[PDB]
Design a protein that fits this description.
Chain A: Dimer; disulfide-linked. The structure is a homodimer. With 189 residues, chain A is of the alpha+beta class. Chain A contains eight helices and six strands; from the N terminus they run βαβββαααααββαα. The first copy, chain A, has one domain: Glutaredoxin, CATH 3.40.30.10. In chain A, helix 1 packs across helix 7 and helix 3 packs antiparallel against helix 4. One 2-acetamido-2-deoxy-beta-D-glucopyranose (NAG) binds next to loops of chain B.
């Protein structure tokens, strides 16, 4: 009868090797979450500008930045499937800020989810589960209305965000609770 | 100050005087200072000083320290002082932030180092923290904290261009305001008045 105010929903449609995607993830989405996580519900969709083709009964993917991007996309899809939400977010952010992403999977996992082996993540990423997860991200990305014009494509309560630097301000404004995080009142107009 | 004939605007200087096990210190470090840096690092110069409310005593030729949260806090303070001495600035900042958000900090030193400074072994850091270098580094942090004018009334004690910051939630807004450059990070114009 009197539920708490709902969090602001943010969706990121991205690809692992897109420069603007990595900047927004690490220097916009992640720090905003660190500041106002209590009023934020983030969804990550690694697929971006990839393309998918049914080749002999199974889905195959082509990525704008090559096979490494397609493989890293599937690694992160498997992280989102096998880890708790916060652990997967932190591990993916950890990787995306690194020069050699594939080779930091183990170290980032050891920090945020040491109970999950990197080998089990790679088995998913190179196996049928990773292909199934990537196909689901393909369908989600294709269902965008309007379709995405570029990556990163950011939705805030299902509406496309045109200026990513406004993320923190818009999340604070859209939150319906009267008691906001202290940062929201500092940046308020 | 260089270049000297048309130099770029200087960054905003931020100092954090803290102790490793203080709850308000860890929140401010991980959920205020770190994300502000992630947003506007280009206009920020951050200094970390691990010591906080610790106390210092010369007992028979060597400095010994007592921490409000016990021996574990004193040991973690010296680990982070040694990190600041042995790693590059950004790597030390990232490693310390990585540790301070964890439940078992001592056991995350190795893992956090493997992410941000794999060339530095945790064994070499622990040798420093438990050796003469860690004691000398901690004594230097004691002197810096004691030199605060005005003296700190609590931790975390945050200085923005050498002035105490009383509302930590205003950090991002104040850093953006104090920066003298005409071209600011895009976030600064979004939160601008
Ligand atoms: C943050 O966003 C996600 C996705 O919007 C939320 O997860 C979703 O939570 C709802 C529950 O209201 C799930 O809907 C369905 O609920 C019925 C029970 O009424 C249940 O029988 C169904 O099996 C299903 O769970 C929805 O599936 C679920 N979506 C996903 C991908 O898990 C989440 O609740 C939000 N978190 C917060 C704190 O708001
Ligand atoms: C961020 O803040 C620190 C501390 O204010 C700055 O480091 C300091 O940089 C100056 C030189 O730029 C050093 O002082 C001078 O060094 C020269 C040698 O280059 C010497 O001839 C002078 O007599 C004087 O000693 C100073 O050692 C150094 N202080 C510390 C604690 O490292 C740093 O430059 C700032 N980073 C920026 C603005 O990007
Ligand atoms: C992909 O190939 C096989 C049919 O041989 C099957 O899994 C599925 O129906 C096909 N999907 C599409 C869109 O053709
Ligand atoms: C600490 O104690 C020693 C005694 O061996 C004394 O000589 C020295 O002056 C003290 N060090 C200081 C005050 O820095």
């Amino acid at each position: 009868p009197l539920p708490p105010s709902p969090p602001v929903r943010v969706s990121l449609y991205y690809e692992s090797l897109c420069g603007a995607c990595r900047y927004f993830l690490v220097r916009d989405l992640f720090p905003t979450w660190l500041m106002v996580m209590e009023i934020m519900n983030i969804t990550l969709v690694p697929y971006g500008n990839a393309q998918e083709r049914n080749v002999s009964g199974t889905w195959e993917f082509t990525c704008q930045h090559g096979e490494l991007e397609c493989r890293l996309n599937m690694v992160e899809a498997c992280l989102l499937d096998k880890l708790e939400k916060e652990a997967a977010f932190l591990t993916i952010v950890c990787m995306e800020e690194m020069d050699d992403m594939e080779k930091k999977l183990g170290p980032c996992l050891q920090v945020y989810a040491p109970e999950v082996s990197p080998e089990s993540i790679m088995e998913c990423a190179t196996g049928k589960r990773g292909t199934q997860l990537m196909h689901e991200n393909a369908q989600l990305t294709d269902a965008l209305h309007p379709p995405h014009e570029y990556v990163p494509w950011v939705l805030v309560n299902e509406k496309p965000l045109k200026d990513p630097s406004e993320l923190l301000s818009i999340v604070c404004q859209l939150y319906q609770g009267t008691e906001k995080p202290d940062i929201c009142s500092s940046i308020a107009d």
